[PDB]
Design a protein around this ligand. Sequence first.
Ligand SMILES: [Ca+2]
Ligand SMILES: [Ca+2]
Ligand SMILES: [Ca+2]
Ligand SMILES: [Ca+2]
Lengths: 111, 114
Amino acid sequence: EKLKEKENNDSSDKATVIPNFNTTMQGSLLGDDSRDYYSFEVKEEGEVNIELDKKDEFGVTWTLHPESDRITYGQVDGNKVSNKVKLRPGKYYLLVYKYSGSGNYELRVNK
Amino acid sequence: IPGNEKLKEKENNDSSDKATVIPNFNTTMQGSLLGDDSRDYYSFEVKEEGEVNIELDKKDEFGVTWTLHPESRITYGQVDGNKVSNKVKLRPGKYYLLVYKYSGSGNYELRVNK
Ligand SMILES: [Ca+2]
Ligand SMILES: [Ca+2]
Ligand SMILES: [Ca+2]
Ligand SMILES: [Ca+2]
């Protein structure tokens, strides 16, 4: 089961809401669509696993920052761009963006 | 720094094929990411293998960083106040340097040197 992104989401004030943990978002970065912003909320301090799965071969990663220099980057490894981050309760912004090519991805925040 | 030259970025540079060339390792690139302009691509050529320093200087307060990858293992800028920096050993070849923002708007300088 997945939830589709909602364009235009190219900046944080237009971020697509990830309504809960354990919700796979589906998106794409085709052509000049190079940025897809999402937001999520943390209600209790804890480890957050953020996982992007590439559905095509292309250069895509992500950058996490709180709504607030605390930023955190996705670690690329083959078809997965991942990280495990200790977050305090708060709203967070997750910029999915590409540096080469074009393609599709899924994004999940696991808690 | 003796010899340093300033050079303006050239829009449109929102994609690697339109990257603004950094022609040597003693140039200061001047750019801005205002409004809808959220990405500036640069490229440079490593002619000899060695350590390269990449430093983005924030002229204004805003959320900006960068991502390096080779034309042919990704490198990210490390944010520390007004400086976003890293050092990486590079082999000869063409490198793509994406300067991009995640919040706000403003100007920056970019210094790729050895
Ligand atoms: Ca999209
Ligand atoms: Ca988008
Ligand atoms: Ca610009
Ligand atoms: Ca630009």
